[PDB]
Amino acid sequence: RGSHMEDFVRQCFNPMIVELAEKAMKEYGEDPKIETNKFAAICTHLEVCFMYSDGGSKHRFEIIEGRDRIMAWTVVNSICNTTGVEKPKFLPDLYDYKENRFIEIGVTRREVHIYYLEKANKIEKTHIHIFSFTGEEMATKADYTLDEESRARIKTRLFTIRQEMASRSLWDSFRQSE
Ligand SMILES: O=C(NC1Cc2ccccc2C1)c1nc([C@@H]2CCCN2C(=O)c2c(Cl)cncc2Cl)[nH]c(=O)c1O
Ligand SMILES: [Mn+2]
Numbered sequence: 001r002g003s004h005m006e007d008f009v010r011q012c013f014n015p016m017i018v019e020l021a022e023k024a025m026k027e028y029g030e031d032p033k034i035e036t037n038k039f040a041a042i043c044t045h046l047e048v049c050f051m052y053s054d055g056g057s058k059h060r061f062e063i064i065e066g067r068d069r070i071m072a073w074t075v076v077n078s079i080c081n082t083t084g085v086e087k088p089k090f091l092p093d094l095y096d097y098k099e100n101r102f103i104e105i106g107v108t109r110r111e112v113h114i115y116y117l118e119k120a121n122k123i124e125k126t127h128i129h130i131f132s133f134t135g136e137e138m139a140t141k142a143d144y145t146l147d148e149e150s151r152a153r154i155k156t157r158l159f160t161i162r163q164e165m166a167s168r169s170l171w172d173s174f175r176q177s178e
C-alpha cells in the first residue's frame with residue numbers, strides 16, 4: 001500500500017473530486033491504492049467535467065459523470081423523455097441544454113487523433129470533446145461548445161497537472177499507463 005502517486009492525487013485535487021473518484025472506482029471494483037495511475041486519470045477527467053460545466057451559463061449543463069451508475073442513468077432517461085433525444089448505449093459525461101446534445105469528455109495522454117477515433121467506435125449521435133495534457137483539443141464537427149477562454153482554462157490546468165507530476169518523477173509512469 002501507500003504510493004507516491006496516491007498521496008499526490010490526494011494533495012492535488014480537491015476532496016469532493018477525490019471521494020467522487022474513489023467511490024466510482026470501488027463501485028466498479030477497482031482500488032485507488034493499487035491502480036494509482038488510473039486514480040489520477042479519473043480525478044483529472046472528473047475535474048475537467050466540472051470545469052466544463054462551469055464554462056456555460058448558470059444552468060446550461062447537466063453533469064452525469066461522478067454520479068453513482070444508477071442515478072446517472074435515471075437523469076439521462078429524464079433528459080431523454082423530456083428532450084425526445086435517443087437514449088445513449090453508454091453513460092456520457094454531460095448534457096448541454098443549450099445545444100441539446102449529450103457530451104463525452106475525453107482526457108488523453110496519447111495522441112489526440114487516435115483517442116477520438118477510439119472513442120468514436122464506442123459510438124453515435126452524442127458530441128465528443130477531447131483534451132490533452134499537451135494543449136490540443138478535438139471536438140465533433142469542429143464545434144467546441146464553450147468559448148475559447150473556458151476551454152483555455154481547462155488546458156492550462158491539464159498542463160499544470162503534468163508539470164506537478166513531472167516535478168515528482170511520476171509523469172513517466174503516468175504517461176506509459178494509458
Ligand atoms: O464514464 C466513464 N467511466 C465510467 C465507468 C467507470 C469505470 C471505473 C471508474 C469510473 C467509471 C465511470 C469514462 N471512462 C473512461 C475510461 C475508458 C473506460 C474506463 N475509463 C476510465 O476508467 C477512465 C479513464 Cl481511463 C480516464 N478518465 C476517467 C475514467 Cl472514468 N473515459 C471517459 O471519458 C469516461 O467518461
Ligand atoms: Mn464518463
Ligand SMILES: [Mn+2]
Pocket residue numbers: 045093104105106
Ligand atoms: Mn468521459
